Design a protein around this ligand. Structure first.
Ligand SMILES: CC(C)(COP(=O)(O)O)[C@@H](O)C(=O)NCCC(=O)NCCS
Ligand SMILES: [Mg+2]
Ligand SMILES: [Mg+2]
Lengths: 242, 111, 115, 217, 69
RNA sequence: UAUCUACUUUAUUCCUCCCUGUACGAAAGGACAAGAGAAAUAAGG
């Protein structure tokens, strides 16, 4: 289907490769995480009626992992589906208009430069930490400690989402996404990359390929690497502010 | 456009009391044109400041940044910087004590 | 970072700076919410029993990359109305004064050099 | 062969593909701009566009006193004193507002990092701004300039006397007592030179990187 | 006591010949500023300072540190 | 030297600028809102 105003599409699951700088045409650094898409695929579509949620859902998984190390219900699942098993399966809330058949590859060019994006991953676990590192500090008549009191305990190793991150550059060959700033998680961690929910960015799905990007469509194929307009590409002449 | 010719138009059209500009060479990477202009009083310098930012703002150059008048509260000095040029509205006594016309011609050859 | 109590190397042709004195000029207040001043902030300054506003021109802790880093806390005096006390500034001044919001155009007419 | 330090990764459990990508961009910049061989003693002059002037450029000259940073974001900080004032700038080698990096005087000092020049005499840190690039011959090793500098009095930036720094370009004999020397030999760590699990061998790394260099040609 | 005799008045008249080639500014305040650079300075000075001020007169003539327009 | 109870991952603000030196006033005066900025704090990385 074509894009309708108010529809949601699929996200991705990507490795966090690491960071590198990226200079814009105004001569400002932007630290950029690389996110490689490794063997991302759609695993199961559940409509809203069977979900009993508000919206339909796509289950999508990334990074092929050994068949010798999974529960047999999972191996039956992937056997019937016809795929090697992915490490993580994340679930996307999605409208009926975007529903790719289960078993289809998702690529890096599902996103395009200029698009803003939200990324969720487990934060780097710091193990048991005390109050000064965890919360950053250090009644009588109340004879008890309130719930949600800030005390020592296990820091990190929790899901956190960085909201509204600009996509600067995508590399179609190696399937890298180059996203602004910092993403939760260590290197080589799997992140869930969806389009941003921020209400300043809720209508710019006009130019994005709506079900997903299909190289199989063979229509006006993409270069090595899409750049955002403001990115100083490597190989461009050295920029002058005249 | 808003060139130094247009600045001469704005200041002689205002009848600025005293004019002296220096073409700053491109190495000394501050500006190109360094305008030194005096007036009658604080009302005069103030009003001709709001006049020249009025004419630059109203004139052209939307993509170019809006320009803030510096030193609105001080009496003797006033200064406004553009892309190519920077104007200094001051008093000729203030000019006598800060001797800017010597400096931007004698970069290491003065006191 | 030029906080309270920091010794300050005044770079001016001013009477207050180049006058000899038994106390080094040191900061008293920094005009930000946190008390940490960077290149292009105003501070109060104690020179010869006289508090005086001042403008930070380069410090010793590193900033962003392509900007310079000095081996002293160079500071230019200024008056309350905003025009500087000085007449010449000998030590080089970073061009990073140009972008910041505040009184900088007055000082950049005075510099011998620019770094 | 000279392979510039920014291509050699620090060891770590990151993925080699990320350095494949970085090296690809680094060589694509090295097409446009010529990045020369230079060490941590050499005198450089760098022309940069200014974000504050309208397309005017500038030149800074000094000593490269550190070559820190790996990958595309790698820097070098050069020092000079002018107007009786010490200045240093961290230059990013691949920031596209640099136009040329000319090597005035290619020379290697005794150390790998000359940060002690902040505490030397200012004559060891001053240079001519308009100094002429000295001509080197094409087929020769580099002149290793040794110059044990003279130090200003004791409250230094860091305790350069300590043997964790391994500073060679000091005339310590002029500016330190024998008692404080023997005190500084307390923090020796003599074993540290002899363990074989701390030694990061960049040899096969160099091989794959030189095939990255040749394959980009 | 200056660098020579003829050089001082030569640079003087040369600055005036640029003084008529001046284009944008108030040329009489310019000429009066040439006076105040030359009248109150070049009267009763030591023979060393004569050299330095005629050298800043040289540089002010050449205008490689900027030129008055 | 912790036995018991309780508990141990529930975005604001300042300044600048613009709109605008318009609205409103009749002169003095002089907006909002929304926008761009730069800061700072807190929260999360
Ligand atoms: C040299 C002279 C006597 C010639 O004047 P004229 O009356 O002979 C007179 O012009 C003079 O004193 N010039 C000095 C030039 C000079 O030294 N200028 C810099 C002032 S420190
Ligand atoms: Mg109770
Ligand atoms: Mg220290």
């Amino acid at each position: 289907h074509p894009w309708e105003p108010g529809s949601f599409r699929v996200g991705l699951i990507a490795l966090k490769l690491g960071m590198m700088p990226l200079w814009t045409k105004d001569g400002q650094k932007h630290v950029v995480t690389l996110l490689q898409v490794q063997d991302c695929h759609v695993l199961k579509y559940t409509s809203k009626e069977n979900c009993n949620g508000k919206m339909a859902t796509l289950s999508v998984g990334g990074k092929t992992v050994s068949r010798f190390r999974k529960a047999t219900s999972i191996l039956e699942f992937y056997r019937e589906l016809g795929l090697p098993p992915k490490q993580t399966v994340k679930i996307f809330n999605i409208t009926d208009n975007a529903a790719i058949k289960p078993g289809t590859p998702l690529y890096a060019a599902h996103f395009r430069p200029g698009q803003y994006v939200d990324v969720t991953a487990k934060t780097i676990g710091k193990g048991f930490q005390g109050v000064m590192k965890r919360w950053g500090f250090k009644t009588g008549d109340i004879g008890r400690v309130w719930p949600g009191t800030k005390m020592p305990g296990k820091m990190g190793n929790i899901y956190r989402t960085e909201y509204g991150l600009k996509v600067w550059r995508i590399n179609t060959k190696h399937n890298i996404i180059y996203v602004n700033g910092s993403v939760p998680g260590h290197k080589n961690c799997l992140v869930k990359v969806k389009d941003s929910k921020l209400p300043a960015y809720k209508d710019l799905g006009k130019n994005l390929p709506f079900p997903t990007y299909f190289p199989d469509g063979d229509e006006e194929e993409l270069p090595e690497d899409l750049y955002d307009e403001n990115v100083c590409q490597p190989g461009a002449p050295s920029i002058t502010f005249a | 456009k808003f060139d130094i010719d247009m600045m001469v138009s704005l200041l002689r059209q205002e009848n600025a009391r005293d004019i002296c500009v220096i073409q700053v060479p491109p190495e000394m990477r501050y500006t190109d044109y360094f305008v030194i202009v005096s007036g009658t009083s604080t009302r005069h310098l103030h009003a001709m400041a709001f006049y020249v930012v009025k004419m630059y703002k109203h004139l052209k150059c939307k993509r170019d940044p809006h320009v803030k008048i510096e030193g609105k509260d001080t009496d003797d000095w006033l200064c406004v910087d553009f892309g190519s040029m920077v104007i200094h509205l001051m008093l000729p006594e203030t000019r006598e004590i800060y001797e800017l016309e010597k400096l931007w011609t004698l970069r290491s050859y003065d006191d | 970072a030029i906080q309270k109590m920091t010794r300050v190397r005044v770079v001016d042709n001013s009477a207050l700076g180049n006058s000899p004195y038994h106390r080094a000029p040191r900061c008293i207040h920094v005009y930000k919410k946190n008390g940490v001043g960077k290149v292009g902030d105003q501070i109060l300054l104690a020179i010869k029993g006289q508090k005086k506003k001042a403008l930070i021109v380069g410090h010793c802790m590193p900033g962003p990359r392509m900007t310079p880093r000095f081996d002293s806390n160079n500071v230019v005096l200024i008056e309350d109305n905003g025009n500087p006390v000085g007449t010449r500034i000998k030590t080089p001044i970073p061009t990073s004064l140009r972008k910041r919001e505040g009184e900088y155009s007055k000082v950049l007419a005075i510099a011998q050099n620019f770094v | 062969r000279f392979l510039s330090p920014e291509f050699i990764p620090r060891r770590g459990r990151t993925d080699p593909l990320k350095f494949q990508i970085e090296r690809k961009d680094m060589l694509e910049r090295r097409k446009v701009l010529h990045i020369p061989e230079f060490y941590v003693g050499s005198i450089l002059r760098v022309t940069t566009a200014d974000p504050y002037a309208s397309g005017k450029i500038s030149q800074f000259l000094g000593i490269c006193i550190q070559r820190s940073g790996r990958g595309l974001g790698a820097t070098f900080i050069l020092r000079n004193v002018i107007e009786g004032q010490g200045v240093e700038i961290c230059f990013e080698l691949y920031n596209p507002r640099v136009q040329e990096i000319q090597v005035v005087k290619l020379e290697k000092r005794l150390d790998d990092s000359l940060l002690y020049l902040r505490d030397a005499l200012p004559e060891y840190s001053t240079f001519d701004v308009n100094m002429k690039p000295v001509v080197q011959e094409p087929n020769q090793k580099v002149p290793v300039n040794e110059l044990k500098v003279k130090m200003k009095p004791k409250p230094w930036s860091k305790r350069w006397e300590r043997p964790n720094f391994n500073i060679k370009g000091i005339r310590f004999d002029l500016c330190l007592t024998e008692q404080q020397m023997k005190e500084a030999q307390k923090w020796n760590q003599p074993w540290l030179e002899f363990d074989m699990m701390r030694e990061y061998d960049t040899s096969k790394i160099e091989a794959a990187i030189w095939k990255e260099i040749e394959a980009s040609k | 006591a200056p660098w020579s005799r003829e050089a001082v008045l030569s640079l003087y008249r040369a600055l005036l010949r640029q003084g008529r080639q001046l284009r944008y500014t108030d040329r009489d305040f310019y000429f009066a500023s040439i006076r105040r650079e030359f009248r109150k300075n070049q009267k009763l000075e030591d023979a060393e300072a004569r050299e330095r001020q005629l050298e800043k007169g040289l540089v002010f003539l050449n205008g490689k540190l900027g030129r008055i327009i």
